[PDB]
Amino acid sequence: SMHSDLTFCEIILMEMESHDAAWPFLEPVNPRLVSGYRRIIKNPMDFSTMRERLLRGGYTSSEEFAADALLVFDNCQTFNEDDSEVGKAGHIMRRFFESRWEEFYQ
Amino acid sequence: GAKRHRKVL
């Protein structure tokens, strides 16, 4: 069901947030701390925004949730060097996310 | 070190 799928999405989001590597993605990026972010990234997304959307019932499917998670990971890849701490963190998050999404297909 | 954009950007 929509409800059971979204329950599991909420769990994935919590589990991502529980990782040490989630630190860059917890809150929206502030371009006053991070130079050029607004110029480079057209569509910002972060875990707090996803959590608020879940709480308000703004996702009507697990696919809508997935689109936001992917935006987080894609923005990270786009903006940061792959060998940077934040670059590495995004790769960790994406790998973990896919490892949990797999449960839909077991 | 601080978060920053790829040098090429």
Author numbering:
A (entry chain A): 1794 to 1899
B (entry chain C): 14 to 22
From the primary publication:
Chromatin remodeling complex NoRC (nucleolar remodeling complex) interacts with the rDNA promoter regions of silent genes repressing rDNA transcription. It consists of TIP5 (TTF-I interacting protein 5), also known as BAZ2A (bromodomain [BRD] adjacent to zinc finger domain protein 2A), which is the largest subunit, and the adenosine triphosphatase (ATPase) SNF2h (sucrose nonfermenting protein 2 homologue). BAZ2B shares 29% sequence identity with TIP5 at the full-length level and harbors similar domain organization. Both proteins contain a MBD (methyl-CpG-binding domain), also known as TAM (TTF-IIP5, ARBP, MeCP1) domain, AT-hook DNA-binding domains, DDT (DNA binding homeobox and different transcription factors), and a PHD (plant homeodomain) zinc finger adjacent to a BRD at their C terminus. Our crystal structures combined with biophysical and mutagenesis data demonstrate that PHD zinc fingers recognize N-terminal unmodified H3K4 tail, whereas the TIP5 and BAZ2B BRDs recognize H4K16ac and H3K14ac, respectively, with specificity pattern KacXXR.
The crystal structures of free-state TIP5 BRD as well as in complex with H4K16acK20ac were solved at 1.76 and 1.65 Å resolution, respectively. The H4 peptide conformation extended from its N terminus at the ZA loop region to the C terminus at the BC loop region of the BRD. Several residues V1822, V1827, F1872, and V1879 provided a hydrophobic environment to accommodate the hydrophobic segment of the K16ac side chain orienting the N-acetyl group toward the amide nitrogen of N1873. Similar to the BAZ2B complex, further stabilizing contributions were provided by interaction with the conserved water network. Only few side-chain interactions with BRD residues were involved in the molecular interface, which was mediated mainly through the peptide backbone hydrogen bond interactions with TIP5 residues N1873, F1872, E1874, and R1832. An interesting interaction involved the guanidine group of H4R19 that oriented toward the BC loop, forming a hydrogen bond between its Nε-H and the carbonyl of Q1870, and a salt bridge with the two acidic residues E1874 and D1875. These features demonstrate a conservation of BRD-histone interactions between TIP5 and BAZ2B in this region. Analyses of our peptide arrays, ITC data, and crystal structure suggests that much of the recognition specificity for H4K16ac by the TIP5 BRD in vitro is due to the intricate network of interactions formed by the R19 side chain. ITC determined an affinity of 23 μM for H4K16ac (G14-A15-K16ac-R17-H18-R19-K20-V21-L22), whereas binding affinity decreased 2-fold for the H4K12acK16ac (G9-L10-G11-K12ac-G13-G14-A15-K16ac-R17). However, the NoRC BRDs are characterized by a more negative electrostatic potential in this region, favoring interaction with positively charged residues such as H4R19, thus offering a rationale for the weaker interaction of this peptide with BPTF.
